[PDB]
């Protein structure tokens, strides 16, 4: 299942709590078409890849996280390893998403 992190303190709390495990962050906005389109797949992928940590950061709710991470457009998927950005890409491309997970997992 996906973690609907809802706090700038919670985001860093989530990453630090992850450890060595790859953390997948879905930066989304309910006002972005492609972001809403891919959301269902991001969640179906979290039920497939149990080994990985799935987080969802609504850019409107956590204006902090999203801002701190240098996010430009939605959707934007970031991969953190030991609280360190070790993978990133924008776009609602599910193939590139699932493929990037394996690459880092």
């Amino acid at each position: 299942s996906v973690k609907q992190i809802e706090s700038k303190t919670a985001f860093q709390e989530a990453l630090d709590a992850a450890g060595d495990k790859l953390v997948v962050v879905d930066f989304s906005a309910t006002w972005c078409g492609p972001s809403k389109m891919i959301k269902p797949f991001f969640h179906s992928l979290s039920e497939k890849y149990s080994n990985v940590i799935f987080l969802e950061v609504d850019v409107d709710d956590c204006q902090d996280v999203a801002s701190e991470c240098e996010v430009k457009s939605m959707p934007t998927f970031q991969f953190f390893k030991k609280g360190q950005k070790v993978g990133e890409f924008s776009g609602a491309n599910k193939e590139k998403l699932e493929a990037t997970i394996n690459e880092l997992v």
Binding site: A29, T30, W31, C32, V59, D60, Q63, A66, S67, E70, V71, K72, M74
Partner: protein, 494 residues
Amino acid sequence: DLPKSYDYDLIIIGGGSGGLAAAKEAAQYGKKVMVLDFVTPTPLGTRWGLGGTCVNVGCIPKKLMHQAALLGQALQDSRNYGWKVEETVKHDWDRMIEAVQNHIGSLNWGYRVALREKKVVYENAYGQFIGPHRIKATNNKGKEKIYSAERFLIATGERPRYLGIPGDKEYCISSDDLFSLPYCPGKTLVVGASYVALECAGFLAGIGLDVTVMVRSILLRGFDQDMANKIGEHMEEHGIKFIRQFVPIKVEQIEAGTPGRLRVVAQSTNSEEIIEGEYNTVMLAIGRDACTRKIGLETVGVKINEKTGKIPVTDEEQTNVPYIYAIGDILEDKVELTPVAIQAGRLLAQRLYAGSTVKCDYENVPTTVFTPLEYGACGLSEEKAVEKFGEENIEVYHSYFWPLEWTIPSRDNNKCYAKIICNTKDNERVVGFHVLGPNAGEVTQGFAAALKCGLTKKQLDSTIGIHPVCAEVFTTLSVTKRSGASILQAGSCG
């Protein structure tokens, strides 16, 4: 009394049109800037994101709903052009609000991305001076914090004014609430005659709603009155009902709902006569008040006009206090428009950190009222021109026009109106420009630049028009009001 070091070169109070523009220009020159932006909730709790009035509850959503109204007319016009559309097409309020807010959100996000891009610090909190070069900032959870800066910029804007009558704050909405209304307004009463009042009444009716406008006295005070009345006249012809010389004294809830039923009790402006009507929604568009009274200006010494709440500044937007500037709607005797706040802010930053001496020019700023039939204007209104130069030195050239796009749908001939105000004394300067028609704003912009260049009737007449375009009507004006000649064009069949 004063920090050994400022946390910033400039702190901006208010992340609206002027503030955000100001912030980016300053940063552009490596200055350390922080924008404080907070949106205190409307009485019903509505609130929105970064961007300011225009972005969230002003220009943007209003023009979008106006477009929605225009598209309704387009559906009708398209039949005669050969498009097989149904006779009556329903409109969905919630879908519109959704699309409108979604675009607003992209804009909110857009501004947050832009600030960071310029490494400008943004703090979603209410800023308030406490002492020389010092300001307090409170967030959503009540967490205060103090900051110091070499300079400050007040760009707090304004918010909807209420009637101060029983039930207005608990049952009536303002423009602040309309643009994100959770349900279709239904039968609506718009209270006011400002451009906000008319534009809103117009698109609401444009989308099928039962609309009524209660006016205290005249329409669009501040604008050319002949145009204003032509606007009202057009609104009236197109469904919008008007109730003149009346002001609400009390609003009572008949039944809560989404929407509910409200009972409005209004009194005459010239008598004790009282009238009451039943409506689903009651919008108050009666003006806005400057947000300059709860930001600790006293603790810093910046003087403002205590009555109006406006802030007096020099021609460089500097208050009475050397390191404190102000821009946007709150300025006293200026122009309350978004592009204006942006120019002022950008130029301020350039004068302060780029060595520029160019000042914002508040003279002959063009404007456009997006009523059903749009109205663009720049320069002096007619009445205002006679006062300044004398009735005998003012020649008014005018004419009706019929947009080609309207001929096939066969509607509204002799409605669109064009007029320029010329100053005979010397070389017939075009001191005033007024247009009532489609895309009024697209039509007025270039002409505003022309007035900036000192356009004369001779130069105007020497300019060739573009055919077939509405704007060309201005290149061949020959009939004056003084001559009393007709300008009433004939219909299709003559």
